[PDB]
Write a protein that binds this DNA or RNA. Structure first.
Ligand SMILES: [Mg+2]
Ligand SMILES: [Mg+2]
Ligand SMILES: [Mg+2]
Ligand SMILES: [Mg+2]
Ligand SMILES: [Mg+2]
Ligand SMILES: [Mg+2]
Lengths: 126, 379, 264, 314, 285
RNA sequence: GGGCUCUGUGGCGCAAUGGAUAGCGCAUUGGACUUCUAGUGACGAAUAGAGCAAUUCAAAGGUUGUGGGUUCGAAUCCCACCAGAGUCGG
């Protein structure tokens, strides 16, 4: 899978975390192929030392920000707020609240998605 | 009662010996054979009850039967020309292998129950040794084989034609324990012994050029479906067979021709019209007689030994599960492991003295202490 | 200006008008840990006292809603007059119940007097046929739940560590107080969530009729969160239909919130 | 050495092992940037068929991801054809994801499309009012390979010996794999010990990421049955010194107990106990397993109002 | 200065009779299912007003009893018990102890019987309210508040809670066809196997009560009680979970009886139970 | 084996009364779930499981230890017996 173009794009950001770039490529695969998304681009964040993906679930909607993290990493709430602000300024729109998706990837490549927004969200209905 | 038969060229006398009777055959004039063994003129041959015999002639002969037969008739309808042509093609392969310094033909005979497999094997072997060859007879029929007792698989080096009455001279056969009259009891063990027989046959071919150039003839079980079919494919691969002779079964011919490598020559042959269907009871009696002939010899010429064996002096296994000596072992056959050196039958068990009495073809002591119990009983 | 009694750190309310005032004016709900004077053999519904968390009590003291005190001790100087008044009260309550029961007996007698005299005359007729054929433990006493005597208690100073207020200064109490205060100013209701694997349960309204929407988890802005805590808490939130809300106070004073939900 | 018994291999793969018996086939894997993957077909399907090891990359449980579309099967089910019938959207992505490397091969704009417009004349059937299919040549390889976790890989290498890990075309040893996996994963010893213990008893362990636990124990496998136990592991001493990797509060335990009773599983706690006489240099060898014990404890919930009678089963 | 704390409502004569001819039916907690959003016009407000007005009447209820069904007691704080002034009732079969020819209770048993209306507790010739009893009996020298909460919770369901006197104790693995591979090198220790010397650090959590099931109430021998149903340790929800050393120590102490942990989260009681476990591996399948 | 005190109500823990309707909780059965989870299915797919402010509602359940007495009327007051617990003493 190393010959895949997007993998070259990910390791082109000059970040320097092979584990994180492989995790990010696993999430790219799981999003593009299995869940069948469109327009999934790879964009780094050197101000936080992260690699992150931008995408579009349904063509014609707003862009999604998905940041992969392995199972050994950990996030202070200050890092969560940092990523919130970074993603807000990354995708562009300041109208919608700040949010991102957390794709936790274990060793055997099982991904769990969790949506961290900013503020109070009603659980299922609203 | 004496009946004389005049046989024309390329005809056979077929006869069956009535239950509890004996029939004498004598060649008076011309040339005749039984399954490729030439008959000596003015020699009487005796056939015991249940014997099924075909006396064939290439040139014409006069034969005499003395005794009661259930049936006796002359037939012109016989596959002997096809069996001869098959042998001639195998002899061309032997001459070619002799000239090129290669191995001889490995021939597997396959087909259902009661199609003449063992008879075709006997004929092909007899013709080969008449031409000065020394083929190995391989016996994979655990139910009705002739190399050893039922429940075994083996190989015999054929040096001379089969005797008309006794069959092939059993000199130092290679024999393995299978323990049952059907491959279906343990198909993995059956295939494992089949591979082991092929390996030891190959080792013999490396050191014995005459055995190598002569090749082998492989008799098989009549189980040609499901796991029985897979065991034929395993045997074909393990022996690296050059020729497969399919008897009286077009479906099996087309299955083997499809599933075997393209270099393997698959041939379909008819069965003889003199092939007799054998009841389950007749098959049981032939097994009991083959076990008796092992202890008592051909027509009772051996005197087997009865003696006690201590439970401490031996280790008994079932195929490896250790078997504690018990009253349930009475009448079971045991293989004496070295391949098998021979067989014994347990006649009684004394738990107080911790001994069992055996019948053995050799006197005490047993030559080896490792015993394999068969699911086969002999009284 | 209500009065809460603090003893070794626990704050209990023993009145009913105080609990009504708290819940219907200040939005504090507490937990009833007592027993019921009508259901003393079950754990379904319970009664007074109402146990307030340390944060609820500090919050109510700060805004000027309650006056924390410390549990008084018996005076030991005014004791004999207490006994005289108690004996007088007891004897009067015992000698005035003798009238209520008597009047009730009169009412019942004159109510069902006709069935009584019916059975009486019927047994008399049966007798005629047969002749022709032949205070204490009844005086009620109350086991009060709130002290029936006024006692002077000295006011407790909550903004200093002591024996009867061990909370002031601990980091966990300051963290939970900042989050509790901010959420309470926003108009929410709060309770405790131990079974739900968090700190608070945040209600859109009074928890008698409304169901909690979030599970609140107080965190330090620099403490490291194990991701497995997040996965287990998000799964528990999905199983019960509540969002997982994370809270942490900033050095400038304001609190920042975050919501964790599932995705696909 | 002390790795197997019957047909004991060596730490170095090369060399005979005195095995004149039923010959098996050892399996190969390569360690790509701190992950382990296996590519050969029968190896994939048997490693997943034997013992239920690993997980495919794309597909959820088994390695059964096919390029075909579940939707486009239902349009022309009837005609005698083979697997690949795809939509032109991913084919358009199949057009350019190779065409860019064609431009990356140094050749200029003159031919980049013409090589592909001839390549649209090892194969796929890309179908197109009429929807026609014209058999296409596969421009860029979309091969599928299985991926194994570190603990499962080491269990097959050390405890079984039928797996061989590679690194820049060079197979590696046992203790080097131990140290490498401890470097990439600072908690490989503990979890591998728990995994080995639980699998040596016939159970099938799988990661319990979705529930927040460490392992999930299956009786016979995910298709055969469901998991019965969720395991939480930690390391302690014989006098019980040691810091737990994830510090356990009781809020965590209430949450885990709730979300495990919900999926009908049993919350276990597996403590590993090693002697105080242990060293930081004898433990770096896999042989240290023999001096460390294991102890399990089932944490459950006692409901006060349910346990006050004894039978009441009629 | 000093704050004045007015308290107490003295039920009149007419208000005790009405409180003796009371009902027994618990009012329903929420009159129907619960709502989701707080935007409403009159349904939300009316249902909330009803749910609140039933509560504010349920809590303003006092215990009223007969003076002959009450066993007068007396709290002696220097000896540390409550001494009865009359023959006990049905509670004497599972609660109490008799020493020196007088019937005596522990402080938590006395408080629990005061709440249930069984005894009429006194102190310095004046009856103790439930507030003053909570204040007097629930010190740290006698019995804490969490322990009394767990004791009361269990006793209100019919258990027998007794103070714990320390003197009370195609699926293959490889190609070869073999059986029972047995690759295990890791041995499985038990819970109490090595806890007789782990008692040297006597400190932290400790067993408090002995619990008997509700069945055993009828034929409970108070002088030869037998082996109990479970032993109980009591913590708070914010105290740390017991380590493996404390687990082994409490398990060795408890002996053969199962051990239970009672957590009290700001008034909510939750019982857990750590139990050792070993499963004999699998079968031939 | 003796003297004294206490106890006996639905399967279990228990209420009730001047003496004038035999019901609360747990367990059981049955609904609703503004419910959640588990299987190999790309047009709300038959099945069990779990439910602790994601909980909520109802029904059914009687040798008031036995016999006797007063009473218009007895779970309720008295007597004797039967069974059990504690204490004292031999
Ligand atoms: Mg009664
Ligand atoms: Mg009854
Ligand atoms: Mg009862
Ligand atoms: Mg509930
Ligand atoms: Mg009545
Ligand atoms: Mg009566």
């Amino acid at each position: 899978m190393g010959t895949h173009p997007k993998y070259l794009e990910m390791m082109e950001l000059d970040i320097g975390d092979a584990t994180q770039v492989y995790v990010a490529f696993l999430v790219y695969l799981d999003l593009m192929e299995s869940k069948s998304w469109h327009e999934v681009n790879c964009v780094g964040l050197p101000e936080l030392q992260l690699i992150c993906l931008v995408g579009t679930e349904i063509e014609g909607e707003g862009l999604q920000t998905v940041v992969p993290t392995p199972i050994t990493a950990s996030l202070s709430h200050n890092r969560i707020r940092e990523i919130l602000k970074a993603s807000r300024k990354l995708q562009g729109d300041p109208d919608l609240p700040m949010s991102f998706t957390l794709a936790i990837v274990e060793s055997d490549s099982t991904i769990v998605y969790y949506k961290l927004t900013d503020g109070f969200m009603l659980p299922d209905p609203q | 009662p004496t009946t004389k038969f005049e046989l024309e060229r390329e005809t056979e006398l077929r006869f069956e010996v009535e239950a509890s009777q004996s029939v004498q055959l004598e060649l008076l004039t011309g040339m005749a054979e039984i399954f490729g063994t030439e008959l000596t003129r003015n020699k009487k041959f005796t056939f015991d009850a249940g014997a099924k015999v075909a006396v064939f002639t290439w040139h014409g002969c006069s034969v005499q039967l003395s005794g009661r037969t259930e049936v006796a008739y002359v037939s012109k309808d016989t596959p002997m020309l096809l069996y001869l042509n098959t042998h001639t093609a195998l002899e061309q392969m032997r001459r070619q292998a002799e000239k090129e310094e290669e191995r001889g033909p490995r021939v597997m005979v396959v087909g259902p129950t009661d199609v003449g497999k063992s008879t075709v094997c006997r004929l092909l072997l007899n013709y080969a040794v008449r031409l000065g060859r020394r083929p190995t007879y391989v016996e994979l029929d655990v139910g009705q084989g002739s190399v050893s007792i039922p429940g075994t698989m083996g190989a015999l080096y054929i040096e001379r034609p089969a005797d008309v009455e006794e069959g092939f001279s059993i000199q130092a056969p290679l024999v393995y324990h299978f323990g049952s009259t059907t491959p279906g009891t343990n198909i993995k063990l059956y295939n494992k012994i089949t591979s082991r027989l092929a390996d030891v046959f190959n080792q013999r071919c490396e050191v014995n050029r005459r055995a190598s150039v002569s090749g082998c003839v492989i008799n098989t079980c009549g189980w040609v479906k499901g796991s029985g079919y897979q065991a034929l494919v395993h045997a074909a691969s393990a022996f690296e067979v050059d020729v497969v002779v399919v008897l009286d079964q077009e479906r099996l011919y087309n299955e083997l021709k499809r599933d075997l490598p393209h270099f393997v020559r698959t041939v379909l042959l008819p069965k003889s019209g003199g092939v007799v269907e054998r009841s389950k009871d007749f098959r049981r009696e032939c097994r009991d007689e083959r076990i008796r002939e092992y202890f008592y010899g051909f027509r009772g010429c051996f005197y087997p030994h009865a003696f006690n064996v201590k439970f401490s002096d031996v280790k008994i296994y079932k195929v490896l599960v250790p078997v504690t000596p018990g009253r349930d072992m009475v009448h079971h056959l045991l293989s004496v492991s070295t391949s098998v050196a021979g067989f014994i039958v347990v006649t009684s068990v004394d738990l107080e003295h911790q001994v069992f009495t055996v019948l053995s073809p050799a006197p005490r002591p047993l030559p080896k202490n490792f015993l394999l119990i068969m699911d086969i009983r002999f009284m | 200006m209500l009065v809460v009694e603090v003893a070794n750190g626990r704050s209990l309310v023993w009145g009913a008008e105080a609990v009504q005032a708290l819940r219907e004016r200040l939005g504090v709900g507490g937990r009833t840990v007592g027993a019921l004077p009508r259901g003393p053999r079950q754990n379904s519904r319970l009664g007074l006292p109402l146990l307030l968390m340390p944060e609820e009590a500090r919050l109510l003291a700060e805004i000027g809603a309650v006056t924390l005190v410390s549990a008084p001790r018996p005076d030991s100087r005014h004791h004999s007059l207490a006994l005289t008044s108690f004996k007088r009260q007891q004897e009067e309550s015992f000698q005035e119940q003798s009238a209520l029961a008597a009047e009730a007996r009169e009412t019942r007698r004159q109510e069902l007097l006709e069935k009584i005299t019916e059975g009486q005359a019927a047994k008399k007729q049966k007798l005629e046929q047969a002749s022709g054929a032949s205070p204490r433990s009844a005086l009620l006493v109350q086991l009060a739940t709130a002290r029936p005597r006024p006692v002077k208690a000295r006011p407790l100073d909550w903004r200093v560590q002591s024996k009867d207020w061990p909370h002031a200064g601990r980091p966990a109490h300051e963290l939970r107080y900042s989050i509790y205060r901010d959420l309470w100013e926003r108009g929410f209701f709060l309770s405790a969530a131990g079974k739900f694997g968090g700190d608070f349960l945040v209600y859109p309204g009074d928890p008698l009729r409304f169901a909690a929407h979030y599970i609140a988890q107080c965190w330090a802005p620099e403490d490291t969160i194990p991701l497995q805590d997040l996965v287990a808490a998000g799964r528990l939130g999905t199983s019960v239909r509540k969002t997982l809300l994370l809270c942490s106070p900033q050095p400038d004073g304001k609190v920042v919130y975050t919501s964790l939900q599932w995705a696909s | 050495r002390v790795y197997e018994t019957y047909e004991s291999p060596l730490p170095i793969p090369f060399g005979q092992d005195h095995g004149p018996l039923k010959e098996f086939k050892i399996f190969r894997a390569e360690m790509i940037n701190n992950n382990v993957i296996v590519r050969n077909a029968e190896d994939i399907e048997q490693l997943y068929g034997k013992g239920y090891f690993g997980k495919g990359i794309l597909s959820r449980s088994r390695p059964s991801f096919t390029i075909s579309d579940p939707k486009l099967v239902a349009k022309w089910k009837d005609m005698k054809t083979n697997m690949p019938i795809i939509t032109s959207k991913r084919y358009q992505h199949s057009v350019e994801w190779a065409a860019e490397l064609m431009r990356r091969q140094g050749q200029d704009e003159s031919t980049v499309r013409r090589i592909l417009k001839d390549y649209t004349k090892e194969y796929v059937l890309v179908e197109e009012q009429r929807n026609r299919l014209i058999c296409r040549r596969n421009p860029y390889r979309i091969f599928e390979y299985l991926q194994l976790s570190l603990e499962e890989a080491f269990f097959l290498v050390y405890a079984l010996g039928c797996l061989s890990i590679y690194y820049e075309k060079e197979p590696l040893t046992i203790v080097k794999l131990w140290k490498a996996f401890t470097v990439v994963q600072p908690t490989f010893r503990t979890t591998y010990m728990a995994y080995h213990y639980f699998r040596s008893k016939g159970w099938v362990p799988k990661v319990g990421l979705k529930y927040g636990t460490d392992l999930l124990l299956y009786r016979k496998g995910p298709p055969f049955y469901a998991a019965s136990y969720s395991v939480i592991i930690e390391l302690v001493d014989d006098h019980f010194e040691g810091s737990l990797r994830r510090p356990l509060s009781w809020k965590s335990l209430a949450a885990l107990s709730r979300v495990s009773v919900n999926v009908s599983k049993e919350l276990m706690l597996c403590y590993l106990i090693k002697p105080s006489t242990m060293t930081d240099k004898e433990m770096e060898s896999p042989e240290c397993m023999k001096r460390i014990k294991v102890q399990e404890v089932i944490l459950s919930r006692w409901v006060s109002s349910r346990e006050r009678s004894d039978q009441d089963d009629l | 200065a000093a704050v004045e704390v007015p308290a107490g409502r003295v039920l009149s004569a007419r208000e005790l009779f009405a409180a003796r001819s009371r009902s027994q039916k618990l009012p329903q907690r929420s009159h129907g299912p619960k709502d989701f959003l707080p935007d409403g016009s009159a349904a939300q407000a009316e249902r909330l007003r009803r749910c609140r007005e039933e509560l504010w009447q349920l809590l303003a209820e006092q215990r009223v009893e007969r003076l002959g069904s009450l066993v007068a007691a007396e709290w002696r704080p220097e000896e540390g018990f409550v001494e009865l002034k009359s023959p006990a009732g049905k509670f004497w079969q599972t609660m109490g102890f008799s020493e020196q020819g007088r019937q005596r209770l522990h402080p938590e048993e006395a408080l629990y019987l005061l709440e249930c209306g069984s005894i009429h507790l006194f102190h310095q010739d004046l009856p103790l309210s439930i507030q003053e009893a909570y204040q007097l009996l629930l010190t740290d020298h006698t019995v804490t508040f969490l322990q009394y909460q767990v004791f009361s919770h269990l006793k209100r369901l019919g258990y027998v809670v007794r103070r714990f006197q320390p003197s009370s104790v195609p699926g293959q693995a490889s190609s070869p066809a073999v059986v029972l591979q047995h690759i295990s090198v890791l041995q499985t220790t038990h819970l109490p196997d090595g806890g007789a010397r782990l008692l040297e650090k006597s400190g932290g959590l400790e067993i408090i009560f002995d619990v008997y099931q509700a069945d055993a109430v009828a034929t409970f021998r108070k002088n030869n009680p037998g082996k109990p149903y479970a032993r109980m340790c009591i913590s708070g929800f914010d105290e740390p979970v017991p380590d493996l050393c404390s687990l082994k120590r409490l398990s060795y102490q408890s002996g053969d009886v199962p051990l239970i942990f009672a957590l009290v989260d700001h008034g909510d009681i939750s019982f857990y139970s750590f139990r050792d476990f070993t499963l004999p591996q699998d079968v031939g399948h």
